[PDB]
Amino acid sequence: NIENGVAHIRSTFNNTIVTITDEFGNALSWSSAGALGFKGSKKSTPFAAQMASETASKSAMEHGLKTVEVTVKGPGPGRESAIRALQSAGLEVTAIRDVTPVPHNGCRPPKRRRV
Amino acid sequence: AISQERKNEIIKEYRVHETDTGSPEVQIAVLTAEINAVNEHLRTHKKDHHSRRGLLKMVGRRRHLLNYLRSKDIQRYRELIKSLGIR
Amino acid sequence: THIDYKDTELLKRFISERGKILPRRVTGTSAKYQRMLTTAIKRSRHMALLPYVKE
Amino acid sequence: AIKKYKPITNGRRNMTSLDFAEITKTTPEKSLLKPLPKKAGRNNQGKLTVRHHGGGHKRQYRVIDFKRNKDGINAKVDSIQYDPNRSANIALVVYADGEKRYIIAPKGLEVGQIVESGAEADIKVGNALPLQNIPVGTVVHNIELKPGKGGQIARSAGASAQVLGKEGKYVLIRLRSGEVRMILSTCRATIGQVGNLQHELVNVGKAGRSRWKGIRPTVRGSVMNPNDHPHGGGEGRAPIGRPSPMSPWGKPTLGKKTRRGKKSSDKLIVRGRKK
Amino acid sequence: RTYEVMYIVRPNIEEDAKKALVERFNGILATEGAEVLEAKDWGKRRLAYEINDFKDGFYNIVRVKSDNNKATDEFQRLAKISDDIIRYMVIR
RNA sequence: ACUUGAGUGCAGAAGAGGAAAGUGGAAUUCCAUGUGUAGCGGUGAAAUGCGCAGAGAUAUGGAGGAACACCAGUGGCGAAGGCGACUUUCUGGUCUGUAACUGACGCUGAUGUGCGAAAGCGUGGGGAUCAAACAGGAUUAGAUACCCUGGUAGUCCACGCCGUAAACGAUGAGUGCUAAGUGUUAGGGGGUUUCCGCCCCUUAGUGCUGCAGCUAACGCAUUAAGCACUCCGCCUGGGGAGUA
RNA sequence: CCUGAUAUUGAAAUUCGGCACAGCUAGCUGUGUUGGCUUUCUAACCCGCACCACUUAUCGUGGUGGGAGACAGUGUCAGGCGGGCAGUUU
């Protein structure tokens, strides 16, 4: 008994996580790149995020869903290659939201790099 | 600081000479009205030091005007020391 | 009216995507009249007259 | 602050006193003093309970108002006197009824103050008013615990508390030991931090003035032969040889918790202690 | 000199306690030798974001003139105990 | 006796120059419940580790502490070290135009004395992130190395000290002087002042390009490393050695 | 000392499992009976909680409150730690 929801996708340069939820954020189904079996340097491959967004779509069409809003963030690739997989698995996508925790200048970054 | 509606009063009670905004008498009298007021900021606040460079600066300016005044007038040099308490 | 901060012309000239201030080159402002228009926005955001992040 | 000493003797080598600059009218008020006979751990059987007590200097108890009644009467503050029974100093307020009383003194206090429940009650240092009428983030001390009982928690020198929020019937207090705790909403609270804050740097410096305060020596355990301490003798000095260091009556003392399942303290203590 | 004191009042307290706050605040903003310039409002208006989860609030502006220096910090110590303001600001 | 230097008065602006007190937003970490569930991470590759006892993902929640996105740029300021969220009280110096003002009242400074980036130390608070020391996995024939999840003194505040750096323009201060073009910031001169339109000028900081001159060469070159004057500091082959 | 089982010890509920197979498609539905987890209310019980009387006693009992509440204290039974202490062997 659900009509509309939100389709979170989060694709860092070492993993890919899709979490299609309800409007409160209640987890309908999630489909990570590690879930499909991309054990290795395939989580850095943009092909893996393509099929990582479509395991969660039909797992959310059986709970009832038409129109979602998409929230993405990632320094790595797959940030827009995987959103159109929601179209290629039968799910209406209209709104795109680029949330990114860009800080207001505090809490110093890690300094592992030694040039 | 001292405002410029009250700075003018400092000149008038130290006019041994007539209609002089700058003298070996009157600006020395103005400097003491700041030294007595900078040094009461500097008995409440102490961590600042840019004021305490302006504090050292203004006195050694007066020590050159006063040592000029020692070498012109015998009884006007001694009057200005006795009038305010400043040495 | 570059002076006071309780007007709506601050809302209509300097926003890009988050409410971030547009530079002095792209808008075409002056230099003296950027300092009167900078901190006046900082007082404008503190009284909820304009958003820090708008969308 | 602390007035130091100069090492004219080996006794006064590092001894450090506490300068009495916040004391006015050094003579007491001869109508609020009650006598105080000592006892070193001598209960109603004459035996010895609690150890290391007794002797020193004679004292005389000074009657303190912890209740804070006399609602809606302006109380001046006259003189800030010295109290030996406790770590804070003391005050001599005068209500406008001429009823001179004692108050434990907060941080800065010479002016004149008010006790009233909710009239306006004038939130300043020295004013006592119930915890439903106190806004959040407000440093209080000398809280009551049971309603109308008397102020119990945080009465030391330099102690404090903090109101956090307001729950359905209680309030929520952070104590000085770091233990969040619910208190009923009609307990009073003095607003402020209690004075005499330089107290724990008083280096006593000498085994004699640590001895006329009412303290006796404390013999360590490993020098008693094993009639009377579980760290008994052995040839030479000896490591303790137990799995756990024990108190002189058998119970392990280093680590094991001691409180029991108690009424009206499990449903109220949210956070524990931090040490 | 000239000041201005602005304070955003939270809603649903000025149908009965209207001028039980603002008259007492302008009974303490306007004291110690202060014939004010103008005491007016801007209205129950729109906020740009949420403040303690209030989307709107009353705006009231008091533009006070005196020649005493720090006789207005009573309002900066009355706006804490009064939980009937949600933000405030003094300029000049 | 003189008024160009040096000082005040009056007319005006531009400031991240200090010092106390409040106040505000966004991200990081940890605690409370759900929906939810086999992976989250990390990487040349991998793991060590946290997870299946319900982790990350995901929402409201509340606890703290610290920095201060966008404006922000060659800009500004202070003698330097340095100083960038906002409001308030207190507080130094510099500059533009000059009618006024006593009338050489100067420049330099051996000792003295006062501020000093960070690290470090002393006695108290407070401790999110980053993180020497430290334990761990592999890379290495060997590995605190470099790489990875972890991590304490320290980082922040208040008080008292230690005074060094590629503390640099690698160029000590003070005065006058000598071809010119092109920017930029705060002010003043000629216009109906056209408003960030415009050119016409004069003064002070600020950068670039470039004669005569000087330089071993590089390159400076009106903010001289040019022509001169005053006073101060220092050097005399490289190690031994800023050691005894 | 710690922890259960029952006694003193009452009502209101809301879900969750064992039977019972009640519907008759491994898992649904819903009645007859059993054992829990919680959640809230007050009537016992408890207060080294406030004035008030016995009384010009900070002991006690009696009295309207305010708190906490079928948990705690207590009785019987049962399990686990127990050189703190005892009886003896070597």
Ligand SMILES: [Mg+2]
């Ligand atoms: Mg430091």
Ligand SMILES: [Mg+2]
């Ligand atoms: Mg034995």
